[PDB]
C-alpha cells in the first residue's frame, strides 16, 4: 500500500487548506482512511477519517471547520480545513487503518508572504574518500529535498536540518564518495522546493 499527499504548500491566513491523498495498492472501499498532522516539538494531532461506507469522523476540536471527502473513481480522499491560522502550520500526513502505513507527508505553512526560491551553492575542495556538499540558502517557506544522483548515494548523505535567518531558511547536505568516483563521474545535487515549484540541479566541479 502506498499513500501520497499532494497540494499547495502555502495557504494565506483565513483561507482554506486543501490536500489530496492518492492511494495505490488497495481500494478505499475498505478499511479506514485517516488524516494526521504533526507540529514542531513532536506533537501529533489526529485530524479525522473517512471509512469504507463514506462515514466520516473528526477530531472534536476540528469538527467545526474540517471536512473529509473521497473520490472512489480515483481511489483518493481529500482533506479540507477552513479559516486556517499560524496555529495550523504543520506537516500533514494521510494514513491507513490503525495508522499502519503513512504517506511521505507534506509541510504546509500558513503565511501571506511570497515564496522565495533557494540558491544552491556547491561545496568542493588527496584522501581515499572525498566529502562534497551543497549549500541551500535564502528560501521560504520550508521545506526542501536534496537528493544526490537520483538517490544512488543515499548512504553517505547527511541532511542537515534547516535554520531560520532574517526570515529566510538555510540548510546544507553533504555526500561522501570514493576519490575514484569524483570527479571522474558526475556528482549532482538536486534541490526541490515545491512551494515555489522550483528544482535546482547543481553539478559538482573540481
Amino acid at each position: 500500500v502506498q499513500l501520497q499527499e499532494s497540494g499547495p504548500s502555502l495557504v494565506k491566513p483565513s483561507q482554506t487548506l486543501s490536500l489530496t491523498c492518492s492511494v495505490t495498492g488497495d481500494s478505499i472501499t475498505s478499511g479506514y482512511w485517516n488524516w494526521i498532522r504533526k507540529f514542531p516539538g513532536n506533537r501529533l494531532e489526529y485530524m479525522g477519517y473517512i471509512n469504507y461506507s463514506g462515514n466520516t469522523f473528526y477530531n472534536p476540536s476540528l469538527k467545526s471547520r474540517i471536512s473529509i471527502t473521497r473520490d472512489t473513481s480515483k481511489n483518493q480522499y481529500c482533506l479540507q480545513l477552513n479559516s486556517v491560522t499560524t496555529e495550523d502550520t504543520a506537516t500533514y500526513y494521510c494514513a491507513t487503518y490503525r495508522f499502519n502505513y503513512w504517506g511521505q507527508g507534506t509541510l504546509v505553512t500558513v503565511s501571506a508572504a511570497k515564496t522565495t526560491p533557494p540558491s544552491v551553492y556547491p561545496l568542493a575542495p588527496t584522501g581515499s574518500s572525498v566529502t562534497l556538499g551543497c549549500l541551500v540558502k535564502g528560501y521560504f517557506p520550508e521545506p526542501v529535498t536534496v537528493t544526490w544522483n537520483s538517490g544512488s548515494l543515499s548512504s553517505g548523505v547527511h541532511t542537515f536540518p534547516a535554520l531560520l535567518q532574517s526570515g529566510l531558511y538555510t540548510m546544507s547536505s553533504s555526500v561522501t564518495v570514493p576519490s575514484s568516483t569524483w570527479p571522474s563521474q558526475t556528482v549532482t545535487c538536486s534541490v526541490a522546493h515545491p512551494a515555489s515549484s522550483t528544482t535546482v540541479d547543481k553539478k559538482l566541479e573540481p
Partner: protein
C-alpha cells in the same frame, strides 16, 4: 481529551540491551497503539491493540499494559532502533503521547572535518559563506571554532546537528560562517577548529583565499 504521558522524554540504550518505554494515561484506556518514526521517514506502526505485533516488524518488539499504564519493550536494541516512539489511544477524542526519543550509546568517535570556501556563484551575488562539515562523531557534544587570519570569530556562524545516524549511531554537524563578499575578501586565511573529547588536540581544517 485524554492526556498521554511518556516517560522518560529521552531514553538512553546500549547495543544488545533490552529497554522498556512507558506511556501513562490521564484516564483508563482500553488499548494502546505504538509508533516508531526514524529520521527522514514517516511514522510506522509497531504495536496495535496493546500487544499485537504488526507486519514488517521484528519480534523483538513487545507491548504490555492495561488501564492507565502501558509499556513498549525493545529487546536486543540495534543502531537502527534510534528513533522517536509514540503511544496512541483511540476513543471519542484520539490522542498521541509526547514521544520518547531513543538515543543509542556507542564508542567515542572523532569527527572527520571538511572545510569549503565560498562558491564562485555566491561571490558573484555578493555573499560569502564558509562551510565546515564535522561528520560521524560521538558523543553529540562538540564545539567548533572559527579563526579568520588568526582571530577568533563568533558573529555570522550557524550550526546544524543531524539526528543520530541509524547505521553507526554517530552524529554530524554543519557549521556555516556567512559574511559579505567585501568582508570575506578583507582577509586571507580561514580556519575551522573541531574540539571533541576524543582528543585534547583539536582537529584543524583551513585554506587561504590566495
Amino acid at each position: 481529551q485524554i492526556v498521554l504521558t511518556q516517560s522518560p522524554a529521552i531514553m538512553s540504550a546500549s547495543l544488545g540491551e533490552e529497554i522498556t518505554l512507558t506511556c501513562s494515561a490521564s484516564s483508563s484506556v482500553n488499548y494502546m497503539h505504538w509508533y516508531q518514526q526514524k529520521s527522514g521517514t514517516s511514522p510506522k506502526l509497531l504495536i496495535y491493540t496493546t500487544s499485537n505485533l504488526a507486519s514488517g516488524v521484528p519480534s523483538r518488539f513487545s507491548g504490555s499494559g492495561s488501564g492507565t499504564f502501558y509499556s513498549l519493550t525493545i529487546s536486543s536494541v540495534e543502531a537502527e532502533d534510534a528513533a522517536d516512539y509514540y503511544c496512541h489511544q483511540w476513543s471519542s477524542y484520539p490522542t498521541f503521547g509526547g514521544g520518547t526519543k531513543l538515543e543509542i550509546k556507542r564508542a567515542d568517535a572523532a569527527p572527520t572535518v571538511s572545510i569549503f570556501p565560498p562558491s564562485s556563484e555566491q561571490l558573484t551575488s555578493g555573499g560569502a559563506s564558509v562551510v565546515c562539515f564535522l561528520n560521524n562523531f560521538y558523543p553529540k557534544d562538540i564545539n567548533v571554532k572559527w579563526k579568520i587570519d588568526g582571530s577568533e570569530r563568533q558573529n555570522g556562524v550557524l550550526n546544524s546537528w543531524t539526528d543520530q545516524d541509524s547505521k553507526d549511531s554517530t552524529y554530524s554537524m554543519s557549521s556555516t560562517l556567512t559574511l559579505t563578499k567585501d568582508e570575506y575578501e578583507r582577509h586571507n586565511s580561514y580556519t575551522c577548529e573541531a574540539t571533541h573529547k576524543t582528543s585534547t588536540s583539536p582537529i584543524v581544517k583551513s585554506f587561504n583565499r590566495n
